[PDB]
Structure formats: C-alpha cells, structure tokens
Amino acid sequence: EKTVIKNETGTISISQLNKNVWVHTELGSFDGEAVPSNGLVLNTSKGLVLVDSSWDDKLTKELIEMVEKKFQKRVTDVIITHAHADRIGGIKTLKERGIKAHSTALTAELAKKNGYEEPLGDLQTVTNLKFGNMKVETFYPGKGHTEDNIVVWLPQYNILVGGCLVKSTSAKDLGNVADAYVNEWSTSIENVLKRYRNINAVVPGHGEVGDKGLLLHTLDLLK
Ligand SMILES: [Zn+2]
Ligand SMILES: [Zn+2]
Numbered sequence: 001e002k003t004v005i006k007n008e009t010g011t012i013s014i015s016q017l018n019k020n021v022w023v024h025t026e027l028g029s030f031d032g033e034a035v036p037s038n039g040l041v042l043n044t045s046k047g048l049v050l051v052d053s054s055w056d057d058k059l060t061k062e063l064i065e066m067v068e069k070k071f072q073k074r075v076t077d078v079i080i081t082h083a084h085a086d087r088i089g090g091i092k093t094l095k096e097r098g099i100k101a102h103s104t105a106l107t108a109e110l111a112k113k114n115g116y117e118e119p120l121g122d123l124q125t126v127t128n129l130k131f132g133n134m135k136v137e138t139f140y141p142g143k144g145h146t147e148d149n150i151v152v153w154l155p156q157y158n159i160l161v162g163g164c165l166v167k168s169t170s171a172k173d174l175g176n177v178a179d180a181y182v183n184e185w186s187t188s189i190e191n192v193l194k195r196y197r198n199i200n201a202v203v204p205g206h207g208e209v210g211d212k213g214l215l216l217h218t219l220d221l222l223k
Helices: 057-069 091-096 103-115 185-195 213-221
Strands: 002-006 013-018 021-032 033-045 045-051 075-079 100-102 126-130 132-137 153-155 159-163 201-204
Touching: 013 057, 013 126, 021 057, 033 057, 033 132, 033 201, 045 057, 057 091, 091 100, 185 213, 201 213
Parallel strands: 045 075, 075 100, 159 201
Antiparallel strands: 002 013, 013 021, 021 033, 033 045, 126 132, 132 153, 153 159
16 A cells, blocks of 8 residues: 555645655645645655645645655755646745746746746756656647646656646546636647557546546546
C-alpha cells in the first residue's frame, strides 16, 4: 500500500507513487463543500519541484512547509499547468519566496488578465527540463479544459500528469466548462495519446490516480 501522509485537518495529503514522485492533494472549501485538487512533488537531488500549487496562498504555504520539512530540501521550482485557482492560486507565495514559477506564455497572459501575479512564461509547446537527475517534459497538446492547459511527462517513469485536461473515473461529466473548448478537447487528448504511447500512471487534476484509461474516459465524456 502506498505511503500517505497528511496534515492535521486532512486538507493536505501526499501519496507516494515511487521513490522520488509523490502526488499532493488539497481540499478547497466552496459553498461548504470540500473540493480536492492534485499536483506532483518531485524529490530531486537539487531540491523539490512541484507540478502545480494549490487553491490559495494559505494552502500553498502549508504544502511547501510540509514537503520541505519531510524531504529536508527546499522547493525550488513549480510548473503551473493552467491559469485557474486550483493550479495558480499560490503564485504570490511562490514569487515572494523566490520559487521559480514556470508556465507557458499564454498561461502567464491569462493569469495577468485575471489579476494573478505572473509566472515566467518560459515553457514552449514542448519543453524539456532537468532538475538534478529528474527529467521533466512539458507538452501543450491544444485546447481542452482551458485554452492553455499543458500536461507534464516524467520519461524515467512514464508517468503523465494530465492535470485538468484529464478527468478521473469518478468524474461523470466535464465539470466547469466556462473556459473550455469542447470541440477541440478530444483532439488534444488524442495528441497526448499519440505522443506518449506507453503510459504507466496518469494523474488527473482532480480525483484518483489511474492509467491510460482516464484518457479514454475523458474522450467518452466529450461525446
Ligand atoms: Zn481548471
Ligand atoms: Zn482543475
């Protein structure tokens, strides 16, 4: 069984996928309803790297503090996968702590438009990063859940962070489609399936970790 570690109220939890990769999950509170959100923690020889922040600054601060204490190293970098609050809500905390906040230019453009502090806008359609020995690829597959959503691939593990482009099994509909492109979203998923033909685990933006079947599930929800 996978190691799971929580804060006191259970609003932040980390679950181990392998020696150096954990999923972080936080509960936001909205109209009295708990709404969970996932990202990744990468434990690298040169610091911790997160995929996504959290709903707000309070949660982002607590997440950073938890992982820095546990892994005994600093959070150095975060990859922001689109400009909604569950992804980027902690950007003020990142910037003031000197944590590098990577994003596409479009994500940065949308963040600014919406009144958030800006991430770096450094990621291209395909970008390859390396942190210590940890390899990370970012990929913009096209519009879907939002116009700017990217996925993150760990080629040493064939782990895909689908983010909010990819729905969990428990999701029975597409959720928030105000900012979505539902006629393009299938093609974007197909672009991911074509790029990564052998996938070991898929982390959705919300809900339980799964596998390639989550991509197929999302295709079915788009019919
Ligand atoms: Zn979103
Ligand atoms: Zn989301």
